[PDB]
Write a protein that binds this ligand. Structure first.
Ligand SMILES: COc1ccc(/C=N/NC(=S)N[C@@H]2O[C@H](CO)[C@@H](O)[C@H](O)[C@H]2O)cc1
Ligand SMILES: COc1ccc(/C=N/NC(=S)N[C@@H]2O[C@H](CO)[C@@H](O)[C@H](O)[C@H]2O)cc1
Ligand SMILES: COc1ccc(/C=N/NC(=S)N[C@@H]2O[C@H](CO)[C@@H](O)[C@H](O)[C@H]2O)cc1
Ligand SMILES: COc1ccc(/C=N/NC(=S)N[C@@H]2O[C@H](CO)[C@@H](O)[C@H](O)[C@H]2O)cc1
Lengths: 811, 811
């Protein structure tokens, strides 16, 4: 049907049809009389995956023969979403499969909806890993993603009586066609035990063993025939484990296997839970053995950093540093100084937040019991590091305690971020402002000691998933004017600037958005029985629920609009559909209250006859990658409204920009760079800058001052307090009011006035569809910088020391 | 190479080779450079299983169109062993696959050794289920085996310092190519809760739910294109199960899923363990819903018994009786009397033991908590049943308490055997003598009330696995003379009687045995580094370790032989290799002591220079189906030496008879019928008959009497007591001596003299190879009755009311 989806040739269509029928029969053991829609999905998935196999084998064979430097991306999260459409896109098979299935009497889009998301992440950090894997494959890098195969990913969110309920994400229930178990590469991982010091160095003995079994998932590059590997480890008990008493011993195998059972969803507050520590070591120990094995199958560890790069995605896999030291010193018998040099040159660390409560600070007593040898290595690293600090800054005793890897206090803790900086040759933030904040504030001491280590690598998103896949209509009208090359060279979108006055293009851009909005309005009614006005402005805020992200500020605006309508009912206002979605971490009470507030506002607003279809508030249940692919193309206004200095980058922001929504946002994270690329005139910027926040903190933030001077704000607080939004439980939102009034770390009131005024300017522009669309074109045209291909090319050149390549492998 | 293995045609060989290469590539993601032997096994398994699919779909389609009466064989055990060779045999693909793999540069026998046994059973009862499935498919019956998919089957046995150690049988570790998950037929199973009595009858409410997910395994008939199904249930938690606290709730899902985790190995002593009760209900509840669903997809439950037979394999699935009543009365709203009539006509029960400690007697308090509605139904069944007894035998109050389903005492218990008799239209024992013992002793009261219910169905074994597969050399020399028809009509082996004087045949039979012995002697040295004399008499006792099976009596003979050699070292004796193997239930202390005794005897005997190669004692580690397939063809003498009246049938006995070993045995179980078929002159019968045992019990068994009057026996006991077989732990075997002397339920001493004398007659015959072989021929020629095809034809005609068919389905 559409060009960017590839050719539907006679030979390929015929072959796809026959292979589909083969899989239905031999693989699924069904015929057409008894086959369920799920059977049809699986037959298609097997048919498509068959096309990856040869490319996968020859890519890995190529890496073996050429022996390039390998890149190992270590993450506890890979938020992959669905794989079927993405594989078709990268193989240029979409139109062929669409045709093939159509001729078989099936709707391929319906089949695509059957696939479970691989929800092996929480949000931004996990999705970044996934975009990065796509870009590394597209850029021809010899890259491997290494993580954990969680049996249960991020919970499915149900809303019951306006409240979040969590249910297990049993994503493997029906089997996963995208993985290949590799039990031949099973590796032992050690826990507990004790350290013996012999004449021949230290030895870690009397350990408990858990097996790490790898599962390989292909990562196809965009039409370059490259297929990289994501290897995820699963925990398995050894067969003599714990071996009535016999029955119990077999049942107890579960304890070992619990390591890979479930993804921790607490992205708000570091919890020093032993199981989480075990997960972190498990991935690191298995991965490092695999890396070392591959390196030896090329004695001379001097060449190790020439052949190996390890990227630590936050501090979660920070134990790689002392683990690499452990293997090099205890097992390979390298001297300390040489092992350290190798380690530093091998490892690099990416920081993803500045919020203190998210920083990993592991109790020493936990490490002492679980990983006794690693603790000793960490102490030794600390001593040698602090000796360097003392030599560089003689007599600066407070610097010594500030920089120590060991934090003294009630319970002694290890600061894993300090470990990561000490043991890495490169440390990067994820947007220019975030990287500057790292140098100026939280890692200032480290920057002063080793300024060469600190870099910026502004985040990006893959334009394959986040344009071609989710928004084929937009991809097509762009390709009609400028060709297909931009899909792997997103900077080419700049060429669209010469179409900003083009009447045909203006019309096409606006038409594609309208279609997307119609499609999404239909999705809502079908799957959720909720009815919306497709001519309204689609105002969307989707991302995890956090106080810093200020879904609450959005709520205040919504109530402001409702109150203004109720005050002057017969005045014209631009109709809006306000959509808010995202999961709250299960133990984060305030985030759970915020969800309940949003639904409670919806309950009042959506049933007020005077409002009509002029304002609708919808909570988007179970926000996840597959839902983002639907709502993002449909959005007009992207809400990116974190308090300046709190959102390290954001990546949702980039997705909306690429898909033709305008942005209302603070100068925070990557928003700054987005406004810089597009021009401030083409962005709806409001609110305190980082400097204004700092000024307010020095003086002291007094919320009462705002409450006292802003009558519209006072009214909303009175409504919340008195039970206007909770008639039967008048005090339901007392926690929210109290927080806003007395302990708001994120200064919701301070940005309220500017935000509301900025929103008025949004409504003004939307009244003029032609000027709205021209500004949209200026956003899409300047979104090129935010391709993860650019991001990965920078990591490659500036951190890993490898050159990317757009050259095809032979097919 | 050999004819009974089928044709190796050019077209088939070429196609097998290409499909093997296809699977290696697309299914296993390997090429020949990196492929492991396990990869080659899997490629072959996938290649073979492809040939089953069409036949499987059309068999099940055939059953749907013809709607024959369906047979449901309910068992907690299916001891299947390996599937690859068996599938090739039944599809006539063996020679073709051998050729195909040979041309690919692979040894197929080596590939076959890679497959794990499906060890989903303990011994005889589990293996019987497996032989029955093979025969039902071969006889064209619309039969389904229903059981549990244990994650862990019977433990692997390791011998460490002469002691049994158990390790988990993680048989699914590498995946199972012989199953297809069927998550679309997932069913809820209910536990706990309480009963409410409404106006509209009883209701079972507030239950906990566990999901039952089925996995289907094909059961191919012998060259008739029939492929039946074995459906095994796996336990899955529902997604809202139990839904920090979030993490724990996900981890707790294990509790629900533990139901199908492990096979109970305690075949010696009934343990009223709650988990075992849950397993029993789980299989019954899921199976009955599946049966009812299939029946409705044909209101009128009068036709239910015309379309459904349920065979209960022992009492383990006895809850089918009250479960069927529950569904019929509570859910379908049938009146009690009609529901009962349907139930009785549907269910039949097979008893497999008379040992009182093996009988299931569930504590009432367990059923009350776990299955409150079933307890009430059981009480009601009991009341109505006892009302019938009281009417038939007025005033016989002791009969009432003897026959009650409820046993009064310390803890009230339900006698599940009594439940099974009451609720079944047929009750059968498994050999003629066992069935007679049931009528005369343990179920005498029930027989008097309902004599028409009691039947015999003598056990059998499948001649596919137990001749063609394991002993192709023997199958071939038989086929050379009498054709191939005997493989599915084993009575045809009678034709071999006319070859008992045939010099060529005598030579061939003896040659095949010698080859088998050479092959097994080689297997031992390669896999276990143990060295044996292949010219010795192979004296084998393999079966689970139990006091009633009297491995101890065999031990006494072994020591007798050793002592006689030591007394007259320069006298000629027929060399023997005595092999004993079998697993002991983990909590069965005496059985564990017996294993240690056997190894301890081996330790003395095998290293005595005076003995030489004249006597060797070997403990066969990890006896299982795949090992039986190796040792049985190699055996000369089959030890079947249970105390008369204790072995219900035995089936190992039949395997040895079919494979050219002579039998030394008591007149117990099927041994009686074997001797009757072959002629007593062609069997080595010794020892007390059942009547002699009864006579001894009335008088009182005094072991001391034997010790006092038999000097050779006294010497052995003195040796055991003094520490001759345990120098460093002189009292190691004190438990064994004490048991033999003071509390031997199985009268080991009473059969000692006759056994030793009988063994002398065995040695005498073996000195004359020509006469040994002629007697062997007379055994093989009369083994026909013991085909499970005969057994199943009798169940079909006399219990299920269906006619078997040898007619091919079209291919
Ligand atoms: C290119 O992409 C792929 C990925 C996998 C394969 C081959 N895969 N081949 C097997 S046998 N895959 C198995 O499938 C099962 C699902 O039924 C999983 O449960 C199991 O973990 C997986 O190892 C082939 C190509
Ligand atoms: C215990 O379980 C967890 C789970 C998650 C976390 C931390 N999760 N951390 C995230 S999701 N960090 C995000 O990273 C994105 C990519 O750079 C940025 O765009 C974004 O600004 C930043 O907030 C911490 C602990
Ligand atoms: C005739 O005999 C058969 C049996 C099965 C099939 C098809 N089977 N097709 C699938 S996808 N089998 C899966 O394979 C996995 C092993 O990798 C198992 O873990 C899983 O339980 C099983 O459902 C086809 C024919
Ligand atoms: C708790 O776990 C268990 C496991 C097994 C059992 C009982 N297991 N019962 C057996 S294996 N019974 C055997 O049946 C064979 C077939 O008819 C007969 O040939 C044989 O004589 C008889 O002993 C009981 C409880």
């Amino acid at each position: 049907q559409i060009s960017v989806r590839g050719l539907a040739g006679v030979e390929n269509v015929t072959e796809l049809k026959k292979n589909f029928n083969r899989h239905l029969h031999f693989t699924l053991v069904k015929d057409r009389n008894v086959a369920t829609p799920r059977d049809y999905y699986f037959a298609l998935a097997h048919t498509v995956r068959d096309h990856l196999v040869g490319r996968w084998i020859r890519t890995q064979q190529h890496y073996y023969e050429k022996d390039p430097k390998r890149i190992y991306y270590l993450s506890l999260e890979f938020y992959m979403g669905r794989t079927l459409q993405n594989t078709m896109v990268n193989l240029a098979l979409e139109n062929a499969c669409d045709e093939a299935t159509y001729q078989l009497g099936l709707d391929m889009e319906e089949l695509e909806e059957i696939e479970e998301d691989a929800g092996l992440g929480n949000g931004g950090l996990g999705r970044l890993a996934a975009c990065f894997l796509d870009s590394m494959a597209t850029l021809g890098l010899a890259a491997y993603g290494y993580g954990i195969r969680y049996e249960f990913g991020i919970f499915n969110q149900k809303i019951c009586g306006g409240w979040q309920m969590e249910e297990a994400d049993d994503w493997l229930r029906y089997g996963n066609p995208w993985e290949k178990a590799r039990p031949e590469f099973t590796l032992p991982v050690h826990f507990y035990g004790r350290v013996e010091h012999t004449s021949q160095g230290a030895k870690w003995v009397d350990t408990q063993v858990v097996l790490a079994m790898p599962y390989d998932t292909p990562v196809p590059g965009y039409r370059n025939n490259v297929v990289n590997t994501m290897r995820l480890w699963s925990a398995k008990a050894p067969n003599d484990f714990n071996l009535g008493g016999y029955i119990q011993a077999v049942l107890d195998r579960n304890l070992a296997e619990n390591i890979s059972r479930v993804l921790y969803p607490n992205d708000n507050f570091f919890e020093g839970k032993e199981l989480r520590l075990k997960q972190e070591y498990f991935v690191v120990a298995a991965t490092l053995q695999d890396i070392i094995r591959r390196f030896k199958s090329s004695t001379n560890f001097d060449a190790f950093p020439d052949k190996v790069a390890i990227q630590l995605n936050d501090t979660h896999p920070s134990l790689a540093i002392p683990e690499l030291m452990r293997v090099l010193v205890d097992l390979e018998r390298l001297d300390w100084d040489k092992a350290w040099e190798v380690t530093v040159k091998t490892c690099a660390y990416t920081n993803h937040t500045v919020l203190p409560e998210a920083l990993e600070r592991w109790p020493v007593h936990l490490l002492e019991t679980l990983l006794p040898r690693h603790l000793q290595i960490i102490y030794e690293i600390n001593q040698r590091f602090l000796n360097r600090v003392a030599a560089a800054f003689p007599g600066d005793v407070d610097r010594l305690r500030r920089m120590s890897l060991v934090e003294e206090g009630a319970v002694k803790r290890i600061n894993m971020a300090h470990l990561c900086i000490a043991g890495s040759h490169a440390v990067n933030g994820v947007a220019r402002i975030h990287s500057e904040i790292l140098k100026k504030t939280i890692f200032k001491d480290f920057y002063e000691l080793e300024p060469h280590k600190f870099q910026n690598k502004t985040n990006g998103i893959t334009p394959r998933r986040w344009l071609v896949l989710c928004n084929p209509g937009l991809a097509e009208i762009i390709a009609e004017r400028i060709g297909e090359e931009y899909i792997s060279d997103l900077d080419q979108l700049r060429k669209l600037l010469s179409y900003v006055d083009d009447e045909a293009f203006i019309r096409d851009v606006a038409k594609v958005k309208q279609e997307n909005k119609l499609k999404f309005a239909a999705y809502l009614e079908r799957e959720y029985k909720v009815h919306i006005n497709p001519n309204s402005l689609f105002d969307v805020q989707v991302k995890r629920i956090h106080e810093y992200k200020r879904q609450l500020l959005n709520c205040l605006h919504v109530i402001t609009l409702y109150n203004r309508i109720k005050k002057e009912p017969n005045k014209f206002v631009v109709p809006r559909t306000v959509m808010i979605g995202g999961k709250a971490a299960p133990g984060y009470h305030m985030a759970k209250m915020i969800i309940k507030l949003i639904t409670a506002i919806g309950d009042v607003v959506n049933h007020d006859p005077v409002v009509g279809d002029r304002l609708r508030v919808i909570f988007l249940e179970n926000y996840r990658v597959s839902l983002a692919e639907k709502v993002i193309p449909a959005a007009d206004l992207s809400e990116q409204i974190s308090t300046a200095g709190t959102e390290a980058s954001g990546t949702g922001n980039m997705k909306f920009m690429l898909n033709g929504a305008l942005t209302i946002g603070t100068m925070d994270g990557a928003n700054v760079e987005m406004a810089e690329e597009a021009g401030e005139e083409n962005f709806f910027i409001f609110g305190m800058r980082v400097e204004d926040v700092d000024r307010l903190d020095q003086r002291g933030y007094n919320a009462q001052e705002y409450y006292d001077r802003i009558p519209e704000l006072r009214q909303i607080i009175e409504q919340l307090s008195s039970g206007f939004f909770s008639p039967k439980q008048p005090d339901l939102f007392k926690d929210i009011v109290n927080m806003l009034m007395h302990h708001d770390r994120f200064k919701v009131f301070a940005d309220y006035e500017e935000y509301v005024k900025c929103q008025e300017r949004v409504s003004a522009l939307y009244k003029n569809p032609r000027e709205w669309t021209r500004m949209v074109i200026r956003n899409i045209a300047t979104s090129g910088k935010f391709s993860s291909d650019r991001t990965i090319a920078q990591y490659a050149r500036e951190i890993w020391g490898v050159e990317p390549s757009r050259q095809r492998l032979p097919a």
